[PDB]
Amino acid sequence: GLKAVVGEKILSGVIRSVKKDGEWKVLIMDHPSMRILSSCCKMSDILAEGITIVEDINKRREPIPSLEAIYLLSPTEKSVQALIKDFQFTYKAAHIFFTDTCPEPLFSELGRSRLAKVVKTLKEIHLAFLPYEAQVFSLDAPHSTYNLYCPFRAEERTRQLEVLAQQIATLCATLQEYPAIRYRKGPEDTAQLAHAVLAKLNAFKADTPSLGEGPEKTRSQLLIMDRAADPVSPLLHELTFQAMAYDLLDIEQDTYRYETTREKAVLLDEDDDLWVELRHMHIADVSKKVTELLRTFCESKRDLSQILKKMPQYQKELNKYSTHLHLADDCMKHFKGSVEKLCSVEQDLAMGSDAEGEKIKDSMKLIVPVLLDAAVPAYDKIRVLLLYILLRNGVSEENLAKLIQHANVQAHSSLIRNLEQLGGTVTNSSRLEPRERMEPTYQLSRWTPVIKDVMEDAVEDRLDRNLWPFVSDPAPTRAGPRLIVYVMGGVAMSEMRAAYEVTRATEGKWEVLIGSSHILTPTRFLDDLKALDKKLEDIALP
Ligand SMILES: [Cl-]
Numbered sequence: 001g002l003k004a005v006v007g008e009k010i011l012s013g014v015i016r017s018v019k020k021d022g023e024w025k026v027l028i029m030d031h032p033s034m035r036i037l038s039s040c041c042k043m044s045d046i047l048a049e050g051i052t053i054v055e056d057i058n059k060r061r062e063p064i065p066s067l068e069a070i071y072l073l074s075p076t077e078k079s080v081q082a083l084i085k086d087f088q089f090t091y092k093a094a095h096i097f098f099t100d101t102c103p104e105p106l107f108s109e110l111g112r113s114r115l116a117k118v119v120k121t122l123k124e125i126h127l128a129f130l131p132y133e134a135q136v137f138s139l140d141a142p143h144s145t146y147n148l149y150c151p152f153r154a155e156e157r158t159r160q161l162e163v164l165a166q167q168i169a170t171l172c173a174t175l176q177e178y179p180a181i182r183y184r185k186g187p188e189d190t191a192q193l194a195h196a197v198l199a200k201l202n203a204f205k206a207d208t209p210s211l212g213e214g215p216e217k218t219r220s221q222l223l224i225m226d227r228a229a230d231p232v233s234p235l236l237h238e239l240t241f242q243a244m245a246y247d248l249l250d251i252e253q254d255t256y257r258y259e260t261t262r263e264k265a266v267l268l269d270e271d272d273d274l275w276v277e278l279r280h281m282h283i284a285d286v287s288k289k290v291t292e293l294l295r296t297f298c299e300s301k302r303d304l305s306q307i308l309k310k311m312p313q314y315q316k317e318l319n320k321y322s323t324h325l326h327l328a329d330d331c332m333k334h335f336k337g338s339v340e341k342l343c344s345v346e347q348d349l350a351m352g353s354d355a356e357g358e359k360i361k362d363s364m365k366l367i368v369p370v371l372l373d374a375a376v377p378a379y380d381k382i383r384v385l386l387l388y389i390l391l392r393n394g395v396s397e398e399n400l401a402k403l404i405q406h407a408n409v410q411a412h413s414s415l416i417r418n419l420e421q422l423g424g425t426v427t428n429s430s431r432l433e434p435r436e437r438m439e440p441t442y443q444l445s446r447w448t449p450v451i452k453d454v455m456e457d458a459v460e461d462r463l464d465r466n467l468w469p470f471v472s473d474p475a476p477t478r479a480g481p482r483l484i485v486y487v488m489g490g491v492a493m494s495e496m497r498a499a500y501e502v503t504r505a506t507e508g509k510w511e512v513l514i515g516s517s518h519i520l521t522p523t524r525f526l527d528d529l530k531a532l533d534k535k536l537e538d539i540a541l542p
Contacts, residue, residue: 001134002513003040003270009127009174010037014072015049018095018121024052026069026091030079031058032128032140033072033099039130042271057082065092068120074128075102080110087115095121099128100166127174128167129515134270135503136496137515139167143540144517145227145489145528148189149421152535160542161189164517165196168486171515172222173204177482178212179220181471182463186430187226187423189488194224198471218474219481221458227489228423229432230450232350232390234492234525235383237343239335239445241286242268242279243493245327246521248334256327266323274324280497282442283335286328294321338376342384343444345370349387350447363391371407378409379526382416385409394428415530422489422529451485451514452498458483459502459510483512490525491516 018025027046029037034056037046046054055061057071057079069091073079075098083096094115101124110116130138147153147160172179178201183194205211212218227234238244245251245268256266268275274293278286301314345366353359360366367388371381385403389395395403404413420426432450457463487495491514499514518524531539 001270002131002137003134005174006036006127006129006131007040007045009125011041011045011049013125014070014097015046015051018070019050020068021050024050024067025095026053026055026064026067027051028055028057028061028069028071030056030073030076030082032074035140036099036127036130037072039132061090063090065089068092069094071096072099073097074099075106075124077106080106084110084113084115087118088113089118091118093118093120096123097121098124100124100126100170126170128170129174132515132519133496134276135499135511135513136491136519137171137513138519139164139515139517141167141542142518143542145422146531146536146539147542148488150532150534156542161193161196163542165193166200168193168197168222169200169204172201172484173211175478175482175484176211177217177220177222177484178205179217179222179482179484180474181222181224182458182468183224183471184226184229184432185467185469187228189423190224190226193486193488194471197222197224214479216479216481218477220483222484222486223454223458223468224486225451225454225488226423227487228430231419231422231424231431232387232447233449233451233494234490234520235386235522236346236350236447236492236494237339237383237522238494238497239283239343239442240279240494240497241281241283241328241331243497244283244331244335246493247523248331248339249327258326258330260322264323266327272320272323274320278324280500282445283328283331284442286324286331290321290325290328297321338380340444342370342376342380345384346387347444347446349384349391352391355443355446363388371403374408378412379523381407381409382412382526383522386416386419389426390424390431393431394425397427400427412530414533415526418529418532421532447494449492449495449498451487451495452502455483455485455498455502455512456505459506459512478511480508481510483510485512485514487514487516489516490518490520490528492520492522492525 015027034054051070052067057073071083071094073083073096080102086094096119128139130140132138141164144160144164147156181194181198181201183190185191212220237247245256249256251268254268256268258264266272270276274290277293278289281289298314298318301310348354348360348366349363367384370376370384385407389400400416404410404416417426423430425431434448434450435453437448454463454468485499495514496519499512503510503512
C-alpha cells in the first residue's frame, strides 16, 4: 500500500541510487525526514542497501572521513544551516537529498560555503508525508490547527495553507495522479486550500504532462473538508477495535503495554497482520474472530503426544494471538461501567433518536445525570456537553454558564468555547448531518461519520456540486481511480475506518485514501481545542 510505495521511493531512489558495493555510508537526518522512512521501511532493508549506521543531524557526531555521508533533510533553514556547519571536516564527502524544493536563498548561501567543495550529489525527491497505514496518510504537522485557527498566529495562517497545499500536491505526484479537486463550499479555508493545491499541482503537471492520463485515472478526485463540517465524529466513543483502543487505553507511539504470566510492549503497526485484520471490527466480533483464526493455525499445524513437544516452536506465532485476545479484554474492561453508560447518551444525542427509532423528546434531561456525576472525569463530561451543544445547534450564553458550573468543569470553560475557532457553533449551523441508513447495527454504534456519505457519493458520481464544487471541470474527452480525502484539523479513527469500508464495498474499483495534518483520538482533539485561545511560543511555525 502506501508504505510499500513510500518505501520504494526511498530505498530505490535514495539509498540504492548511491550504493557502492565496495564502500559503505553514514545516513544523517533531521526529525521530519526520519519519521517518514521509519514509518515504512525496516532497519533490515536499510542495512541491505549499504548503510553502516544511521544518525541525527541535530545531535553532535564524530568525524568519519573514511565513510561518505548521505543526508536526507527537509529544506528548512535549520537543516541546511546545520549541514553547512558539518564542513565549516566531519566527513570526506556527502550526498544530499531534500524532501522538497530548496528555495533560492538557502541554495545560495550553500554555494558560498566550504561544504560545496566536497559535495558529490545533490537531488530532491519531493516526498513530504507519513504513510501511517496502507490507506491513511499524515502530513506530520500537528501544529497545523493552531496555526490556522489561533488568533496569535493569524499572520501564519496563509503560510500554513501554502505549506499544506504543497505537501498535498506532492502526494498526488507520488501516486501518479492529476485528480479533480473539490472542496466543501461555505468555509473560506477549504476553498483557499483547494485553489492552492491546484496551483502547486499544475507545477508537477507542467513538468510531466503525462500525469494522471488514462480512462481510469482521469476520474480520480481529491476532496477537501474542514473539521467543523463534522465536529461530532471526533468526539464519539467508537466501539471498533482501533478507534476504541486508542481512546480508552493509553497508547503512545502506537505502542500497547501490558503484563503477562512479563513486561510486553507490542507495536500496533502493519507488520502485525492480525492487527490489520481486526483494527476495523466492532468490539463484539473481535473475541470470536481471534479464536476462529486460532482454531485454524493451531490445529492446522497439528494421540497428541508429539504436539506437546512442538509447543515451544508455536509459542512465538502463538503469542501474537494472545496479544490481541488480551487487548480486546482490556478494551472491554474500560468499557464496563461509566463508558457503556456514556455511549448510550452520546448515540442518542448524535442520531437524535433513541434505539427504538423514536425521536429524543428531552435532550437536556438526557445529559443532566452525567454532568452532575462526580465520578465522571472532565473530558468525558465535556464530550457529552459538546455533543449536546451541537445537537441543539448552539446554546444560550447563560445556559452554557449554568451547564459549565453545574457540571463542575469550570477550568475547561476555555476549550469548550474554542470550538468556535474551527467554525463550529457553540453560542447561538455549518455542520453536515449524515443521511439516515436503514441498516441493523449494535445499539451503541448507530452513528456513521459524515465523510462516509461523501465518499460513497464521490464513488457513485452523485456528490452534490452545490456543496462540493470543482476547482476545475475535467477536460472533455495501480490503474484504477483513486478518491483522496483531506480533512483539515485532524482525522478521527472512524473516518479512517470509513475509507476501508467504502474501498471494500466497491470491490477494488476505487482505492479510497484519507488523511490529514495529524491523527485524532477524542482526547487529542480536545487538547487541540484547548490551545486555540492561548499564546504558545513552543508550537512550531508552519
Ligand atoms: Cl463546478
